[PDB]
């Protein structure tokens, strides 16, 4: 149900079983886990 | 049959120390490096323990009401206690929930229920063949039925360490029916440790009726049986909570409002 | 249509998805009654 914009890369991470989202101060989900098993992070700020 | 046995006494109502038992991940949803805020119903800290010191001299399962959020412990000796069948008036005339196990898969119904005044667990001393399981004897006007996995599950006559603990907690929101784990490896005399765990979401089960009163389930020992233990009881309090999760992603350390000006200063 | 029914007698207001089907003899104070005994009826009530 994510859309958004911006950038991925791989995790750094010590994500649970059932988790998806981070929102990190906030709201922002920060990271997926990709529905096809994979655990990334997530910088939506590109650069602006 | 109401297979209900001579060996129920009326008790002392003996309580203790809640320092800082019953944590959950209250979502779905990484936090790291902060201070996060919100509001539930949870044990208050430090409060009382409802202590139930059932020996062989007492057996304990009287009428247990809900009352506005719950939790259960038991430091257990090869899970003896299971069993959670909720509902409204505990007879047929109430379609309850049974919530029980064949030992190693969770079964539950939802329906009107031959709820008995002692249906049980009719468990041997050294095997525990449940000779009196008949738990599912009448079924009509049904709502629900649901079956889990078939998981590793041991029931047997035990003692020594506390070994086992469950750390129930059962949460309902607008029938959703929550249901939290966590595992914790002790040993006390049977004085109640102090510390604190995440409890963790095994389940929901939507399931919707008037979720008031209900019983535990134990297994009797076909002379009954518990052994030099105890069970404890809580209730959940509607309070704001201040948690503090690390850099590794865990539940470090929760603080509430509400039972301490300190601590209202802390989450200030 | 008097084959489908609902209810329409309780003890206070309701809950969020919730569901009882307990035709309770019905009465403003308890009495588990033999309905239609006076101030004991049924909360089901048919379509027409």
């Known amino acids: 149900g994510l859309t958004g914009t911006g950038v991925l890369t791989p995790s750094s991470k010590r994500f649970q079983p059932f988790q998806q989202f981070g929102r990190d101060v906030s709201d922002f989900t920060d990271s997926v886990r990709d529905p096809k098993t994979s655990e990334i992070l997530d910088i939506s700020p590109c650069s602006f | 049959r109401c297979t209900t046995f001579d060996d129920v006494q009326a008790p002392n109502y003996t309580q203790h120390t809640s320092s800082m038992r019953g944590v959950y991940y209250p979502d779905e949803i990484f936090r790291s490096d902060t201070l996060y805020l919100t509001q539930d119903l949870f044990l208050p800290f430090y409060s009382n323990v409802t202590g139930f010191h059932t020996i062989n001299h007492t057996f304990g399962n009287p009428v247990i009401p809900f009352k506005d959020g719950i939790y259960f412990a038991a430091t257990e000796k090869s899970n003896v206690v299971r069993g959670w069948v909720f509902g409204s008036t505990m007879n047929n005339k109430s379609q309850s929930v049974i919530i029980i196990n064949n030992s190693t898969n969770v079964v539950i119904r939802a329906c009107n229920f031959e709820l008995c005044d002692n249906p049980f667990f009719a468990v041997s001393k050294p095997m525990g063949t449940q000779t009196h399981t008949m738990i599912f004897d009448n079924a009509f006007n049904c709502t629900f039925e649901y079956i889990s996995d078939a998981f590793s599950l041991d029931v047997s006559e035990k003692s020594g360490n506390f070994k086992h603990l469950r750390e129930f907690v059962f949460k309902n929101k607008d029938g959703f029916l929550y249901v939290y784990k966590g595992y914790q490896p002790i040993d006390v005399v049977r004085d109640l440790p102090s510390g604190f765990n995440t409890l963790k979401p095994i389940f929901k089960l939507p399931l919707g009726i008037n979720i008031t009163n209900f019983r535990a389930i134990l297994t009797a020992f076909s002379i009954w049986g518990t052994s030099a233990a105890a069970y404890f009881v809580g209730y959940l309090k509607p309070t704001t909570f201040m948690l503090k999760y690390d850099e590794n992603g865990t539940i470090t350390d929760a603080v509430d409002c509400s039972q301490n000006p300190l601590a209202e200063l802390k989450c200030s | ?48």
Do not use: M, Q
């Open chain 3, 1 to 48: 249509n008097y084959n489908y029914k609902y209810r329409y007698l309780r003890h206070g207001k309701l809950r969020p998805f919730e569901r009882d089907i307990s035709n309770v003899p019905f009465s403003p104070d308890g009495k588990p009654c033999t309905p239609p005994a006076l101030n004991c009826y049924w909360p089901l009530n048919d379509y027409g």
